[PDB]
Design a protein around this ligand. Sequence first.
Ligand SMILES: O=C(O)[C@H](O)[C@@H](O)[C@H](O)[C@H](O)COP(=O)(O)O
Ligand SMILES: O=C(O)[C@H](O)[C@@H](O)[C@H](O)[C@H](O)COP(=O)(O)O
Lengths: 467, 468
Amino acid sequence: AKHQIGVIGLAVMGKNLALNIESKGYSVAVYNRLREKTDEFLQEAKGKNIVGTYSIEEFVNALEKPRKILLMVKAGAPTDATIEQLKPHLEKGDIVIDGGNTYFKDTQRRNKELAELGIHFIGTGVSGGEEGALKGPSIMPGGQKEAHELVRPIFEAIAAKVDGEPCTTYIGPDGAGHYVKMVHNGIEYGDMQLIAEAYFLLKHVLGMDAAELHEVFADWNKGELNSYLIEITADIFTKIDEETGKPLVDVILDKAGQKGTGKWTSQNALDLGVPLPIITESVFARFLSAMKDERVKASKVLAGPAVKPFEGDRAHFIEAVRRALYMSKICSYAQGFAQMKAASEEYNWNLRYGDIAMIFRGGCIIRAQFLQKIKEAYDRDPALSNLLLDSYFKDIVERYQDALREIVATAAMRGIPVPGSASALAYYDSYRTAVLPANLIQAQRDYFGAHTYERVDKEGIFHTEWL
Amino acid sequence: AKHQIGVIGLAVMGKNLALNIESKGYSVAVYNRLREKTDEFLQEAKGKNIVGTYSIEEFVNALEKPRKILLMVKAGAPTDATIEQLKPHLEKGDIVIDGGNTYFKDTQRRNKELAELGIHFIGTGVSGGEEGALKGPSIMPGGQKEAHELVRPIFEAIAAKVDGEPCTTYIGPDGAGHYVKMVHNGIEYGDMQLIAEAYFLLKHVLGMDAAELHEVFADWNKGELNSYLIEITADIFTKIDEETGKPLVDVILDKAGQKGTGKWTSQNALDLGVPLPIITESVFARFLSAMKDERVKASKVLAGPAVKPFEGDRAHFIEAVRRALYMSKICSYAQGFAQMKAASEEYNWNLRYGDIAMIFRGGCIIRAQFLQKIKEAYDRDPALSNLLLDSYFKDIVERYQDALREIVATAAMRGIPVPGSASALAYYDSYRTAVLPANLIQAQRDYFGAHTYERVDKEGIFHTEWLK
Ligand SMILES: O=C(O)[C@H](O)[C@@H](O)[C@H](O)[C@H](O)COP(=O)(O)O
Ligand SMILES: O=C(O)[C@H](O)[C@@H](O)[C@H](O)[C@H](O)COP(=O)(O)O
């Protein structure tokens, strides 16, 4: 018999997506190199319209033309080796979809190589984790338009929906979807760091235990901060470790891990020439936390300030931490969306930033009502160069900046590190400043490397003989 | 005949090095892919023991064996293309030296490829701008030790000297030299930002004009901040523009350019898992400065804080800025040398940090008295994991931290951007803190992604069914 779509790669992620697809009424053919994974899945999927296949050739010939193939294998060599194995069996107009957390430049290369053979390639971000894949992920496809239209109904049936809108859209050509999935990941790290900072601030300035941290974050999730990450943070602080009777979170080693994918947004921001301080500080902050042994060692030798207990208005401070968090979150998204814009211009993608905010509204980890406000900003002005300039975000920052300045000043004086929040404040004060101190930098570079400069008053290039 | 050393690539950097080599008694042959650069240089080099050659074969045949060839061409494809031109003609035991601003993995590759052929390869950082190349640069070579020994007298002859010692040493195997050169360049970016922030603070908090600013910086260069960058800064603040009667600095457009190599230290830190906040903020600050139009447009619509004029002790604030600047620089170097330690362990380079500190002492842009203190820290402890643990630097930061706190708080309250200095403080506060909020991050990661965590009280990898 002929099946509607094939999935290669049967880890939980691939299995759940194939289950999602089948529940939406499509017939699914599966293949996995490690034989046992297929055997297990077929027992897991009794009664469902999923068939196992046992070679690449069997798999390919079990599918309706034009063929739809979802790769969910290990990044790098195994993905390419599978694509290589598919090539002889596929025909002009067949569609290979890579759904892993792939570096967009890899997707660009595979797209280009397959195209020469008339085979289409879609690199797609899948967000939501393992449960999300089963129930409704965010899906971020990029590749040929003609190929996307063929697979679009499948994407649209399996994605999460907000207000009848599927959390999927055609992102753009080549590696656009994988690019946007990378930025999602970056933004995710920033949010987690900014929240970690709000926690540490409450813990140290106010001496808050887990139970009252629960209350605070639970309240926060009833307002503008409403989001999956805040939601789960409120719940984390309720958990009691049985063995010790301590809050579970206090027993967990403060050594933040990360996949090698974590650093990609920051590294790409550096290539494009776009400032991404908050997300980059967030990545560095994980690295510094992983240096736990160095840190406890330095704690016995390095002195902080000798500050007395906090005696100010406690309710005021809680709210100031909240507003500092929300403003910082805004600067981070402004930096992240400004990155996607530089990428769109550079790779010629014509990205729609309102559409991107729309797919982030559910399914994915950064999902929050917040993403609605971003969509609206781009609805109103598609070519908006920075989210800070939109009237909604502009109102917030003019009202919340006092709270962010107080938090930065207070953290500085009490010895509480707030790398993300501080760089958020510095970014805000740099972006709104017409004349920066880069005139001296420019003067210096000319002085020692005769790099030449431009002037404030005249047009054209200049070079002084300083020496 | 036969000349002692060859130079390929006659941009100003390669011409000056050749000139430099010649002035130390060596005979030099030169070649350039674009013929007119050679003709031009030869007009400039009459009086000098330098000859031009016009093919790669002629070039190679003009050199005494073992051949010593210095490559000063554009990075990437053109370097590789020149190496390819050279390969048919080189003989076993010949030495090619890439003095370009080369990514260290490229050097690693070229080193391997050339080694299989019996040809040695040295990738060398050369620092100090064009005047340094001419008068005395810092030379940071990496490669086969035996090959280095053969070029060592030439490096030592031309390098800058400080108190009789040349600013050059054997860095390590393969790409180690170009790696240290990269980090030097990262550190340079950080120092320039920290200074720019010092400037901007005095300018907006104290209302200093270019005359008061000059004073401050000249008075700083007589102290522990003594350095080339601070010296030229004190100088820059004296230049008046004739056709405006304005300080020239007030007339230069605030868009900081950068070479494509500028981002590399930060990108690599990300690869190695090392915290490099200050240098990276400095790269990003240059990117922000380049966005000049967005900033003017934004300046009309975005609100700053309400600020009364500054009322506190003015001499105190200048000293706080000075101290904030010195401490921040300490944190940046602490970060940058920690990155070198990481790369050394990763690539098995057995880096000698005191030696590196000593060759940064002259020739290169970041040259400063301060480097002696770094050298001494590694004398006391070669295996030192972070400079903040050394008694000199520990004592400085504990003394000056109060100043840095004041400057970060003041900047916040007054709307003055201090990205580099604020990240220095956050870094200090993070590094000295035994228990950071990453416990929450680990909880979150396990909650939504089953990533697992570790516990403070026992060994093992743990997962929680968070939903119940
Ligand atoms: O749900 C998702 O969005 C994906 O599964 C994935 O993008 C993941 O969250 C990141 O790669 C970060 O994971 P770490 O926090 O483990 O680095
Ligand atoms: O002296 C050096 O260090 C090098 O010859 C060279 O690498 C360069 O002068 C700097 O890297 C400046 O870089 P920018 O042009 O980016 O300021």
